[PDB]
Chain A
């Protein structure tokens, strides 16, 4: 790409930069945050006006349209259906299937436009936004239908013009509106637009409907009745191509030339010289370019004028000649001060068979990659793209699908569709999917569980860890320690599980009880993720055994937690205090040996407190409560030891 010598489209932001304020910006995942800044404090004004507004610039307003949301879900179902079917069909069956897939995309576009039309009639303030969206979707369906005919159906000489007449008829409805109004008149033949309705049907190749209008004139006007019969016969005899005839293009051309000579003979004989409108219709049947241009207002578009010219001058036109006739029709139709519209460049490129130029022009004109992504995907299934990797290692199909899918990831409900588009991107799709999965705003546990299922199905172990760590941190900020611990265990983050376990132990030291009992009781094998979580789970098992009156097992477990050095030194007082009720029981629960181990753990802690105390903090009130607790422990240990020695000595006889 030569760098585009196109001035970048300036997006004026109303109210931003009023008063020589500097603009600050921050890029989001698909949005630009803009804010005003005071970049230079020269002057102590403590009254510097707060930046009152933060602007969110969105590149894709269309992604948020409720109606276009249906377009994206239905088009995704068509896309995924196409990709799954790519292995099953060969030759002519495949072509018919791809034309059917093309028609399914156009049917979704049409249904979205019909819904927008019904909504526009109901709501005056949003009507203008729906009218502009209907115009864009109409231009998309127009150009898509042309691409279906030229590339997917690859229409040969003969069937091509039939499909172009059908194409104009599906996209230019003005003649039918004129004829409906003429027919609602009490006297259709006296209506100002009556001959415009006749001429408009002839321009569209609708000879039978033109003849039905002429039959009304032949009934009303006794003087015109002879001329109406000649014109009805000319319209009836007009050779038409049929999509299943045994007729050769050469046999058609000879019949068409003979019919044209019959029209010309009637004109030269002055058969119509008493009725200017019948004479004009006969000149239209001869392909008279002056009269076709005089009827510009009935055709409204240069491409309707093209198809009318092809019908009456070149009915056997080849695909290779279409661009020449299209260019000539545009130049003749635009021969005043009117510049070609961006849609005209798209349609001309399609008639040139330049698919790359069609894609390029639509990528400039469209806010959304939807058209270019799905059209390019469907044309790639037609084998119309050579496997030329772009300089960046992806092909054009994959590039457009990646950008389209990235667009869907910006939206809170559509990011799930973007996942499946990335799975059909062979080179970069997986790396894009990893990057976008980590950036998803996790506002709810339900959304996180959906994202995790998607990552787990695709073996994305790092993204699973990242999502679980993010949810664990959010749960921790929300003071939900059990939820935070569960998410940390699922992340397999031993350091984060330790940090949460230390907060549970601190909350127990402050409150005397655990907040989330049921989760700690069900840790199972996940208890082994860290030494601190092991301590927390075993210390909870002690409280459970104590509540079940299993005092001997509880005492042995409590002792094992101290001797194994898995308890944090800050918590050793609490463990020794929880041994007090067991030491004071009437029955000897701790043996003389176990009581000596508890005495050792108490003295090891008293030694550690003497070493950590720099001399200057001896004077705040926490030292006395701890000393009373230690004296109570020494008394309970001495009383248990005296009882244990008496009971053990009495069992050794």
Chain B
């Protein structure tokens, strides 16, 4: 959580504060006149040392999920929370939909070098793919049968993984294994509990947050 917060805090300081006062006296002695220095120094904080260390943290976090059995419901909830905070590091910041962002020609969007976040998201997805059906089975089972908080976080994790899964491998697994049908069929069980929440003095709102997480995940699947 604090790693996700520190990376997001670095990204919010704009680059105008490294240009006033004290290193300008030692580099004036290599005279080579050739070519304008005008693009290569803009991105050197987050990107040159981070990728390998983050991929190791992801692998180890996925392995720690697989080592936890069905008895460790609170541990699982923390690990799904950790994985959601990790997946938030690779998230592109919401660019404002300015009228000028549409002046960027379709040509500049096809020839722009791949953004560092899209590289990290792809490399993270290749790591999820290396754990195969074992990780898919654990997350899908905890989304259907888990404890209230575990179900919510597993559904939020599925919403996030399916949002980045361009090959639709997780969607194909969820359909072919029947978990997508179990999640849909359980809406009839939620109906009985959701009716009780409309009373002036409702029970604990846990069923509402499970329903919201389930419907958010189904809404995500419906976008393809």
- Chain A residues engaging chain B, CB cutoff 8 angstroms: 87-97
Contact = CB atoms under 8 A, between A and B. Distances in A.
A103 B193 CA distance: 32
Contacts of A91: 144-145, 178-179, 181-186
Contact of B183 (A87, A88, A89, A92): A92
B157 interface: no
A243 to B, nearest CB: 14
Interface in B149-187: 177-186
Contact of B143 (A88, A89, A90): A90
Contact of B145 (A90, A95, A96, A97): A90
B185 to A, nearest CB: 5
23 contacts: A87-B70, A88-B137, A88-B141, A90-B140, A90-B182, A91-B144, A91-B145, A91-B178, A91-B181, A91-B183, A91-B184, A91-B185, A92-B178, A92-B179, A92-B180, A92-B181, A92-B182, A92-B183, A92-B185, A93-B182, A94-B182, A95-B178, A95-B182
Contact of A96 (B140, B178, B186): B178
Interface string B127-151: 0000000000100110111000000
A95 B181 CA distance: 9
A94 B140 CA distance: 12
Nearest to A94: B182
Mostly, the B contact residues are: helix
- Which interface class (under 10, 10 to 19, 20 to 34, 35 or more) fits B? 10 to 19
B157 to A, nearest CB: 15
A458 to B, nearest CB: 23
A91 B218 CA distance: 15
B179 A90 contact: yes
Contacts of A87: 70
Most buried by B among A88, A91, A92, A97: A91
Closest 5 CB pairs of A and B: A91-B182, A92-B181, A93-B178, A90-B144, A92-B182
Nearest to A91: B182
A94 B177 CA distance: 9
Contacts of B140: 90
Contacts of B70: 87
Nearest to B177: A93
A93 B181 contact: yes
Contacts of B177: 89, 93
A209 B183 CA distance: 40
A191 B93 CA distance: 82
A96 B181 contact: yes
B158 to A, nearest CB: 12
Most buried by B among A89, A92, A95: A92
Nearest to A93: B178
Contacts of A92: 178-185
Nearest to B180: A92
Given A89-B178, A92-B185, A96-B181, 4 more contacts: A90-B144, A91-B185, A91-B186, A97-B178
Contacts of B183: 91-92
Contacts of A95: 178, 181-182, 185
Contacts of A93: 177-179, 181-182
Interface in B180-220: 180-186
Most buried by A among B70, B141, B143: B141
